[PDB]
Design a protein around this ligand. Structure first.
Ligand SMILES: [Mg+2]
Ligand SMILES: [Mg+2]
Ligand SMILES: [Mg+2]
Ligand SMILES: [Mg+2]
Ligand SMILES: [Mg+2]
Ligand SMILES: [Mg+2]
Ligand SMILES: [Mg+2]
Ligand SMILES: [Mg+2]
Ligand SMILES: [Mg+2]
Ligand SMILES: [Mg+2]
Ligand SMILES: [Mg+2]
Ligand SMILES: [Mg+2]
Ligand SMILES: [Mg+2]
Ligand SMILES: [Mg+2]
Ligand SMILES: [Mg+2]
Ligand SMILES: [Mg+2]
Lengths: 57, 52
RNA sequence: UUUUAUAUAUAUAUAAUAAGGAAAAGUAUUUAUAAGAAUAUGAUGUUGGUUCAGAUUAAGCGCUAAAUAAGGACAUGACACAUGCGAAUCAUACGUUUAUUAUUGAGAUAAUAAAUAUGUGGUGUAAACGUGAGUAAUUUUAUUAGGAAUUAAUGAACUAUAGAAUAAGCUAAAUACUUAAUAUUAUAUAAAAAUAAUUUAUAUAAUAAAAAGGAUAUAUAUAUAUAUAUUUAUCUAUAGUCAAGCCAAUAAUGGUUUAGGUAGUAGGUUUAUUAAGAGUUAAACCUAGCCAACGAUCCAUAAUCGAUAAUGAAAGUUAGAACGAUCACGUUGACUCUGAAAUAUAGUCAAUA
RNA sequence: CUAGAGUCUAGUAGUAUGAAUACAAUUAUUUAUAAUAUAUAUAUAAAUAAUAAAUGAAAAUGAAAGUAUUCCACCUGAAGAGUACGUUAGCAAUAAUGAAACUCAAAACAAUAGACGGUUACAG
RNA sequence: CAUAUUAUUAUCUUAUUAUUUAUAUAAUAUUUUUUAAUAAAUAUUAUUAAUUUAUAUUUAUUUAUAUCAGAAAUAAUAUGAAUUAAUGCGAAGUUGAA
């Protein structure tokens, strides 16, 4: 939306976020960085556990 | 001569006619209703949203 | 097709069977409007350029030329200029200067006639006129049923209303100048909603900022004042009108054989300045940005436009002379006063002659 | 041509009928499958050849040079000229980008008839 | 190699102007402490002009910043150039056989 001159080239200001898909991207990145991490840790645990189970054999 | 065809084939300009009342009168209810009606915010919106 | 019948394992193979037939007489405006020719070839068809037929002009020149009416007329050297004009006006602002009459005794004072714009003052030259140098947009032009900072206790010069017009000084005197007197915004309380602010009302704070008399008459009284009326001025306040300042979106020539450009540069935060936003200008501190092959930056050129002119079938293209709108400039550059508005055709300084 | 290695490697450089989608009548061959009992002169597809219609200046194309859609690149008379200058890379060589003035009414393509060739043969 | 004009600047110079520093027995108004001349009345007491004094309004002087315009340097935009590259045309021809 138009406003008073706020700088040499900035005559508009954010009025309404019609869709926040960029915010969704930021949140999903931040979440994923650790959400994948927990699954990776338990996957490594399972893999080494099956290694040990075969080692008993 | 061509452009004059847009205006009824009239060559020459009168000064733009002035308005005796520069703003709507109180008795003119409709303009007041539009002015004091709920302002739409959305894809076609005119004002900052609630939290903005 | 469908429905059933037999047989065989709800289903399969066979046989039969089929509901769709109704009639009736009478009950224009068409729209916009686009043509080619000559020249290749030994001849043909095609591509392809060149030229021609049409209209026009801010026109020039050659030859020629009767009268009248209307419309235009230095596009080039924004080159230099002899000479005369283009902005004056007011004597009812203040002063001076005479002549007569009356009273006073060289003058003094009145009344009536005049003269006085070389003395002090008011209003006018921000317009209009001319020009197109600068200007490719950092403030220019065009358009929008566009905005705010939500533009000033600005009226510039008229309208309609109210009021006021005081005292001194300096001028020789004043409607000249000074000094002084008197006459919206910010707070706080609430109310709402067109609300996450604005508006409204109230009460305070300061608003608190002015002025000027002349011309006539009369009426008092004691030539002196004074007091009314009529005229023309002056100041303040509300609103109206006419006006201003600022920003946005879209468009505005050619060259990338100009490919990188920009460090106030791009953004944020404060402060000063403004009536008012903003790196607009000045100061300070932060961030590293911004523009760009849909062409930046740089260079060259150009005043821009129309319901204007030319042309076309039209989209468009060209001009920007003439009519009109906007801007810029008044030999060149910078700054200052006044003012609401000026880097003024003003003033100061410099440059050129 | 340049470097490193002992002749080799590592290089610089970047020259010398566009793509996709929908559709489009036959015939004859093949080709590869799918069947049905060598025969159905078997059907479904792709490759090849001559066509039809269609297109084109024609030659010719003929499932594309056709009917349509979408994206990109390219062209604007001949010569000057892919020249000059500048830039870009490159040690350089070269490459890329790339004009302008002057001159002309030309120039070019397909096809037609000809005479020409040591052009071919063949005859009389 | 030579002439010309705009643009800029870690440079030189600078009119005027704007802020900005400092200084004035520097002025003018008012406020004091005071000195002379003059008036009225019975020692005066006040008055004007001058002496000192501390607030404003300016002047001179200076400090800094910016600044018209000038140089100097650079770059471009042009205009001319000995020397020099290429190519276009035409006159009748001359030479090769691509
Ligand atoms: Mg001929
Ligand atoms: Mg005439
Ligand atoms: Mg002229
Ligand atoms: Mg008089
Ligand atoms: Mg006078
Ligand atoms: Mg003017
Ligand atoms: Mg006055
Ligand atoms: Mg700037
Ligand atoms: Mg010009
Ligand atoms: Mg033009
Ligand atoms: Mg111009
Ligand atoms: Mg005109
Ligand atoms: Mg004229
Ligand atoms: Mg001017
Ligand atoms: Mg002149
Ligand atoms: Mg000037």
């Amino acid at each position: 939306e138009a406003t008073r001159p706020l700088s040499k080239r900035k005559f508009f200001a954010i009025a309404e976020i019609i869709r926040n898909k960029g915010q969704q991207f930021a949140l999903y990145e931040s979440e994923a960085q650790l959400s994948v991490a927990k699954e990776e840790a338990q996957k490594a645990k399972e893999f080494l556990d099956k290694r040990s189970v075969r080692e008993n054999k | 001569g061509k452009g004059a065809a847009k205006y009824g084939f009239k060559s020459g300009v009168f000064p733009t006619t002035r308005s005796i009342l520069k703003s709507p009168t109180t008795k003119q209810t409709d303009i007041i209703n539009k002015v004091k009606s709920p302002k739409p915010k959305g894809v076609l919106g005119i004002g900052y949203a609630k939290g903005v």
